[PDB]
Write an enzyme that holds these catalytic residues in place. Structure first.
Site, PDB file in Angstrom:
ATOM      1  N   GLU A 241      65.061  45.521  40.115  1.00 28.97           N
ATOM      2  CA  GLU A 241      64.735  45.378  41.484  1.00 28.97           C
ATOM      3  C   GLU A 241      65.857  45.583  42.301  1.00 28.97           C
ATOM      4  OE1 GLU A 241      62.096  42.740  43.638  1.00 28.97           O
ATOM      5  OE2 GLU A 241      63.731  41.125  43.498  1.00 28.97           O
TER       6      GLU A 241
ATOM      7  N   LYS B 133      58.483  44.441  50.612  1.00 31.38           N
ATOM      8  CA  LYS B 133      58.134  43.268  50.348  1.00 31.38           C
ATOM      9  C   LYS B 133      57.370  42.427  51.576  1.00 31.38           C
ATOM     10  CE  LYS B 133      60.439  39.878  47.285  1.00 31.38           C
ATOM     11  NZ  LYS B 133      59.644  38.626  47.702  1.00 31.38           N
TER      12      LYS B 133
ATOM     13  N   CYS C  67      59.175  40.163  42.592  1.00 26.52           N
ATOM     14  CA  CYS C  67      59.570  38.784  42.662  1.00 26.52           C
ATOM     15  C   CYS C  67      58.799  37.829  42.892  1.00 26.52           C
ATOM     16  CB  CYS C  67      61.142  38.630  43.339  1.00 26.52           C
ATOM     17  SG  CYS C  67      62.186  37.161  43.171  1.00 26.52           S
TER      18      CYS C  67
END
Lengths: 317, 317, 317, 317, 317, 317
Positions: free
Chosen positions: A46, A128, A162
């Site tokens: 990430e 995201k 995440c």
């Protein structure tokens, strides 16, 4: 409508913190290393390119303001040298690559997953949807028009980052598109071996859970006082593994905080045995509950009919 | 994607009223003066070259008709001697120049900002989108195709004139293009300290605020009766200064009506510390409020396949 | 279409930090004090009822997790005793009230402005469109359906909070509804004299800027160590004042951090003189720039055709 | 396709200056006066209801700022008592009415023509596309979506105001919709005979040319000084007449400044004899010249999905 | 950008009907008359050189076919002796000349306006865009490539013929090119003082209105029967006059339908006083209405790479 | 790519002159008559519905003015009762129909061929590209977007009118679209046999040639004088016949000036034997000669984003 059989690799590693140029070459070296063993898909933990902003969790916002400068200088604009290097690496080893970075589009940063192709072209990008507890101080939100699923030679690929796995709406959105192989990008701090396994069970896909690790130089440049150092020394680590459509492991978990790669043989044909039991977006549905997936591109400012302006050269005048 | 450092100059002065050539030579002299001190960017107050039309504010339209003749005869067409003089001045001193004038394009006038490049070529032009209260009698409106932001060796430049700072949509249009250094052209009559400082705060840019001054020789021709003279004697003045990305001054304000120039050291890397807080077109956005920036060229009459015709000379016949 | 004349009060005070029950009675006493002097409109600084989350600024997120407990416990739900008492106070003094509080709806907190009629009915609510730098941890975002402008006996009222004044699209949204009196809510830390004055100039309205102050009891619980006390001691305060349509003060600014109330005589008839110059959403517009205001109510889950179910009592069974 | 025959009335009169309430009843009684003689269509000179703003032509803008107040107070918002009264008058006499007024929509004034059916309903509205000279200080601009032609029981009706007759594109826009009867609204100051006669000839329509007049009570308030009085005393008046499709008068022109009405027997069948010669938007066209007519509504701010919101009444709380 | 001052001559006369060689003598004899009086621009009526086809209006198409023979054989080939004689007349008197003729190009006739420089070179040509009523039996149509405006030493010159003044799109095409002096060629029959006067104000140009007259020798060949003779005797005559940019005559028009010339002192700088008021293609424009001007040359058959082919002479063979 | 076999009918008849209502019912009864014999395609002579304007050929334009009124009042607008009746007739008999009429669109008349489908829907329209000598006073020109070839159950259909058969570019445009069955609409006066047979030979198609006939009632209203009566009595008549792909008749020609129908059995398989020899737009082509076919729609004014405006009913007000 194909059910291929290939070999996958989930890379566990840490970058050179907040140094894009060195992280890019390290990523290329890892891609070459993983492909040399016969992998057809490589995933990275990430925010790998510049590095994950751990400073945002161990200090007050005015302290994070100091390091936001360094993170900003090292961002990855879409037309850039880092993306050219990663495209070269992807084409050279003829593998799909999923690498996440702190993309900047205008005057703000975003967390994105960049997908590459054995031909070396950027086939898509995923932002995201919402930033986590302290990531809100760094990255902006995404949109519903940036949740793609790619029909490729190795099945329908996709991914999330995440805590996007703890939001059932994103799970439904990805299930609607008939995903078959999933890349789960995690940092090291959060608990990830329960969200990824449940995602594998519910969406009926193979999951490549990738996680990062902490280096000493990261701590040296991040922690300033002794309290910050002794507080950051208590952060746990995330594990790297590949899971089957039933939620059980199919590979060998990377043993510890050490760098490593986990390989597995992914047979997409096996998801059919579990589409038989439960399909949340198909036979296992109710007419009372529904979902709206609006995916129009919605930037703050829309520009139309942009043309190129002329310049009256010095000779012309 | 660069963050240079340079010295900026914000010129405060008044032209030779409604006389184009004297104003052009004065502008060249001022450019040379500013460059001799090391400035890399020189900004000029407002409607500088012919002069700002104060006559439109102290008399009825039939009285303004008398001076519209003189203003019209002194307008600046894009291919002209004034523009080549300014181009020579810019190239000789290797500086960027932002000078505004009453452009003539066809049958009527427009107010435009002309941007010159250290090589001496007119890199772009910007037209006022809507004339102020009494300026509606003099100038026409602009378009969305003429609000450029130039990516240069000293950052992303741009500018607006007068009350274009109080229109939030223009602020959004400029912010959507990632502008870093801003030039705020003002005349002397309006209150300009609030608008410029707020613009610097709300767009995270260095604002060069330039204003003009009044001259007795101007009053000699503008005011005819004693009532006009005593009314024009009450017009307030405008200040000149350079503001940082937070809105606080970074230079020394030009002291009074006296002609002068203000210098400051502009470091574009300081805007990153304030993109951290607020970014209206970026992370600080809401999906419910949007904007449509249609920027196609929209002249009243489009001409296609323009051609040059033949002439049968006297010898030919 | 009415243009009334009335007296308005801007309140500068601080609550009993993170104690809703004492803060509500304190606000009632302040409303009585303001109304006993003839005020017909009383505004309150910011996040007044429980208090503003200062803890989120001087510590890392894990330190803020503790104070989030107390903030959550003291939050305000719309059917609560806080609204009961505030409505009683508003009806008792027959005044309009604008009080901000940390509303809670479900399992999440929001920051809202509540408006009370002289009859005591909650005429509307307005959720902050997006939290600032460090309040992203505490409060969620609002939507476009909660930007009301109320037609009342004292004009068209409305309001924003903190950095909602630095988002030009918010200015345009408020202006398009023809606001006349604006209530600006600020906390002490941020600079507010430029944003509020510019808002008054741009929207042509009377701005009642209200700011809070720091109590000595608050620092007892917020600051745990010396490195936090010394840091929090440097937080500058905010000013309270009322501005005219041109941004010039029309009241006497509260002199210092001392609790006080500022009174002004508002003549809504006066905005017409300044609608003569500029009207960003009216005559001072351009067809190339336009805004979209989608004000559809968008909750995450929509519940339809809900009914009151029946329960079989013990005697029935 | 119908070619009716009917009687028309063109009105020459002046209102009670800036006294909307009295002007409305004056216009109503004038409608009864015109209808009692058999008129089936009644037209009014221009800006009749409040009164044309002559003050903008005899003083500087800081002097027009004072009378803009009175003009603003007496503007006509569409849901108003003025429109109620005019609709009652139109239905009472079963006639078509074309009345112009200083419409206000939000915070800005516009100049509009209101059309009323014999049933009493407001069939359409038309905002002036561009103010003329000093009018730019008062009114905003219209758009392309507000240029309607109404298919009625007495032909295809339409209209333009003042100098909209000197813009060829407006002529083409009206001609393309197959107008047959045209109402030309004029003030008294400008030269109106040539423009209306040319419009009649070029568009092949009957033109009802209506012009206003100057009252002494208007001068008793507009002219504050002797210079202004002597200047305004020189303003020439405008004529009132009805023209045929060939530009030849077909009625006895109202003789002088005296109030009066001109009657004519309109026979829309007669335009066919002149469609034989020229039809600019038809057989008399060239493929090289073309016109683009965008009729989309272009408000500055678009509002979507507006929903009435609830209020928690006092008893509920 | 020059604003000269000169004397213009508008010629009223009639040719030797359908006799090209005899009309060219008269044309030169009249250029000397005007020039000897100081004229620097001489304008002529429509279809002057061979004659205007009046036969097309007083008989059926088979009767017109007889006279098309004479008109066809007296047409003006561009390379011809008629143009040679007029070319040297302009240089001999050093004046601009605008003379209309019945050009033939290929196998068909066209109506054109020929412009001659003071040096005797044919600087341009303008074909009629569309024939009027009965003229459709004689002449073909033009195109957009044939609408030039000449930048000269006496301003920007232009012209149109007969009912091209009643087509609003033709006005915009010329206005788009910033014309300053206009030549309006008319024949006797049609009404011209209304379309030409309006063109002066709608375009802000001096208009030289030139018209032809009826001779007794024209009626002998044209009118055959006595029913035609009395019908041709009811044709109203035209008028010759010069109008200023205001639309008001600046010269005493020719006394009657006799042969004469009208003189005026044209001063181009005073068109500026009317660009202040209205400018359809400039500041007086609305973005909703626009026009397309495709000015490509569009002949029916386009030829490329025309070469020279050899001839084998009798000696060679 | 189908080659059907069917029966075709070419109709020779005349309408009730300048009377749309009677002509429509006459056409319907003729369609019924043709269909009762098995015909699957019925073609009508020319300008049938109102009637062909013979008045234009025997009198001067001012005489044609009178009858243009009657022609205009009887024109066929596309949403009309005539088209409804013709569609009912076509569906009732289940045959393709090709009928020509004087369509009106706006204020101008056009000559068009309307094509109907056995289902009764108007499949297309074809405006005449250029009007004949005396037809130019009546009808306007068409464009390139209205030259369709319809792929149907009976082959590819198309048509032209009158002298459109003598324009080689029309032949090439129709050839490029692979037409197989052609309908040639003619009036009586002109020579038609030579052009139709050549078209059949050159395009390799079956040509249905239809022509009209002069009735005695037509001459009563057309010829107002004896000189006109004896002149109109000399007009020669047209011929009705059907030709093969080689110009050889395949049906018995209608004998004389009598109403009648010609029947033929059309076998579209026979064009293959003649595409073997020549195909001008195919294998029988040369690279030196090329043609352009710009078929964009080119109405004089283009309208964008048309929308329906609202009206405030009497109840609402």
């Amino acid at each position: 409508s194909i059910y291929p059989k290939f070999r996958a690799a989930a890379v566990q590693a840490a970058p050179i913190y907040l140094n894009l140029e060195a992280s890019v070459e390290k990523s290329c070296e890892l891609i070459d290393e993983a492909a040399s063993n016969g992998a057809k898909l490589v995933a990275f933990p990430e925010a790998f390119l510049p590095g994950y902003p751990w400073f945002a969790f161990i200090g007050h916002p005015e302290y994070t303001r100091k390091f936001y400068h360094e993170l900003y200088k090292n961002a990855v604009e879409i037309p850039s040298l880092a993306i050219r290097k990663i495209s070269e690496a992807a084409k050279r080893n003829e593998t799909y690559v999923c690498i996440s970075c702190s993309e900047k589009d205008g005057g703000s940063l975003y967390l994105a997953q960049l997908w590459f192709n054995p031909n070396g072209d950027l086939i898509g990008k995923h932002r995201k949807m919402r930033a986590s507890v302290a990531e809100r101080l760094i990255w902006g939100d995404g949109s519903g028009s940036m949740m793609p699923v790619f029909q490729t030679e190795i099945g329908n690929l996709g991914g999330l980052m995440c805590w996007e796995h703890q939001v059932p709406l994103d799970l439904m959105a990805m299930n609607a598109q008939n995903e078959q192989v999933h890349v789960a990008s995690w940092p090291g701090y959060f608990d990830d071996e329960i969200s990824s396994r449940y995602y594998a069970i519910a969406t009926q896909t193979f999951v490549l859970m990738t996680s990062s690790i902490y280096t000493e130089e990261m701590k040296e440049m991040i922690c300033l006082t002794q309290e910050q150092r002794d507080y950051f020394e208590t952060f746990k680590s995330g594990h790297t593994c590949i899971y089957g459509p039933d939620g059980e492991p199919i590979s060998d978990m990377v043993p510890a905080e050490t760098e490593g790669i986990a390989y597995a043989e992914i047979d997409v044909e096996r998801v059919i045995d579990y589409k038989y039991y439960i399909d949340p977006a198909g036979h296992y549905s109710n007419q009372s509950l529904s979902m709206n997936f609006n995916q129009q591109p919605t930037p703050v400012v829309k520009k139309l009919n942009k043309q190129k302006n002329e310049v009256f050269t010095y000779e012309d005048i």
